[PDB]
């Protein structure tokens, strides 16, 4: 009943330890990159399969 909150505070502890190294965002300075030329994408980029819910419901 109140065990949940105890677990929450516990997890918060571990996050606090990582906060000193993972607490702030990076690559924040104002750099730019060269424009990416849009070439004829006849067979440009492919796709890395995602995760469909519980996945395959085999018959």
């Amino acid at each position: 009943m109140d065990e949940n909150l105890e677990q929450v505070s516990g997890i918060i502890g571990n996050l606090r330890h990582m906060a000193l190294d993972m607490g702030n965002e990076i690559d924040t300075q104002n750099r730019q990159i060269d424009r990416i030329m849009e070439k004829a994408d006849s067979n440009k980029t492919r796709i890395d399969e995602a995760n469909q819910r519980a996945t395959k419901m085999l018959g």
Partner: protein, 424 residues
């Protein structure tokens, strides 16, 4: 994360945080209006018919998907008002996630998860991978390219089929070699699933119908966790799956769940992954991080950015929490790696977000969804950043009553389930 901008779909483009964009990867599609809600994160309030040309139609497929719940409607998300409500809904959910330490940490990890600069044929040259950028059209007609980590987009044909995908490299396996790649999440804040609480194994006529509604915030967090794994290139090979026997549907006898999924669920389901396998994975990715640090140590030049070589090497030193000695050489610290790996795969899990949000949710993937509901979380009388559906100081605050579609019925419209499956 926190969205410090008051975005309205009709807001004029400015080529900065509101613009028509193109994903160089996805052929030469039509430019779509997008909104940058946070550094490295964009939102495209359109049905996804861009990432995969194969999925251009929005009508039910010839062969119905064999899943517990599905929903189709080719007209959803076609008007400016819907797109405006979608943008506001997705924004509100990001804020709800941002309302707890767990969520704030996950979002920061995601913003820090910049895809590695390893697209050069010259092993000693750092170069961007075009698949991890988008082209932002300017009001003057010109455009500029920009790197980003995450894009939230509307669903494809099956409205409730939410997933996290990305563009691949012709040879490299970016989501599993530690490199990472820009993630595209198909999601919708306008619908949610219905489920029943686990059977008491005693006196309970299965003739129910998914009375409780899943909190949209958990569903989004779920996809963001996948994005996290994929941005750091530590996603488990989809070839690794767990076979499960099921008696839940007629003509079906089993279920296949990827280890990636089990890891992302956390709690009980994650325990289905063996200890030997778990250590195997941790060691595997640890080696991948070492290869990256090695690549960074051999980098002599960089092409394609106004930034210096030292700065760009430092971005990744920070991303992978690498150690740098007095001579400027990078190395993977075993202790640091374990803590980072542990946070990304064991702390960031669906089960832990359920605990932080204090909501009712399925306990295992074996408890299948049974219904789909239309919802509207934008109005504060319906849903709030801090409490979701279970509004404080009301009848909805106790026993997850806000998620009980029979008690809090003004918040839901039961929709037709297009499933071909028949529950046994």
């Amino acid at each position: 994360p926190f969205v410090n901008k008051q975005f309205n779909y009709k807001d004029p483009v400015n080529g900065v945080d509101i613009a028509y964009i193109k994903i160089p990867n996805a052929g030469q599609m039509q430019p779509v209006k997008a909104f940058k809600i946070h550094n490295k994160i964009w939102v495209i309030p359109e049905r996804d018919t861009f990432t995969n040309p194969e999925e251009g139609d929005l009508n039910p497929p010839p062969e119905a998907k064999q899943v517990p719940v599905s929903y189709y409607d080719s007209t959803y998300l076609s008007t400016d008002n819907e797109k405006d409500n979608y943008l506001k809904g997705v924004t509100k959910l990001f804020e709800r996630i941002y309302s707890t330490d767990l969520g704030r940490m996950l979002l920061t990890s995601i913003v820090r998860g910049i895809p590695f600069w390893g697209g050069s044929t010259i092993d000693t040259e750092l170069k961007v991978i075009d698949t991890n950028c988008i082209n932002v059209i300017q009001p003057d007609g010109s455009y500029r390219s920009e790197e980003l980590n995450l894009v939230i987009i509307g669903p494809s044909a099956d409205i409730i089929q939410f997933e996290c995908k990305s563009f691949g490299h012709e040879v490299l396996n970016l989501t599993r070699n530690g490199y990472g790649s820009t993630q595209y999440i198909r999601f919708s804040p306008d619908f949610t699933f219905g489920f029943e609480e686990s059977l008491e194994v005693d006196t309970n006529p299965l003739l129910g119908a998914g009375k409780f509604a899943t909190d949209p915030a958990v569903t989004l967090a779920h996809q963001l966790i996948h994005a996290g794994h994929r941005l750091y290139g530590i996603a488990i090979n989809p070839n690794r799956v767990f076979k499960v026997n099921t008696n839940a549907y007629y003509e079906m006898s089993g279920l296949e769940v990827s280890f990636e999924e089990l890891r992302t669920f956390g709690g009980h389901d994650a325990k289905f992954i063996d200890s030997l396998q778990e250590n195997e994975f941790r060691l595997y990715y640890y080696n991948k991080f070492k290869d990256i640090a090695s690549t960074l140590n051999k980098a002599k030049s960089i092409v394609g950015t106004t930034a210096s070589l030292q700065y760009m090497k430092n971005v990744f030193k920070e991303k992978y929490l690498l150690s740098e000695d007095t001579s400027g050489k990078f190395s993977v610290d075993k202790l640091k790696f374990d803590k980072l790996y542990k946070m990304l795969t064991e702390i960031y899990t669906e089960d832990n977000f359920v605990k932080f949000f204090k909501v009712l949710n399925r306990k295992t993937f074996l408890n299948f969804d049974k219904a789909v509901f239309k919802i509207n979380i934008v109005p504060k009388v319906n849903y709030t950043i801090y409490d979701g559906f279970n509004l404080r100081n009301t009848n909805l605050a106790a026993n997850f009553n806000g998620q009980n579609t029979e008690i809090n019925n003004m918040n839901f419209t039961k929709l037709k389930n297009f499933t071909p499956l028949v529950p046994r």
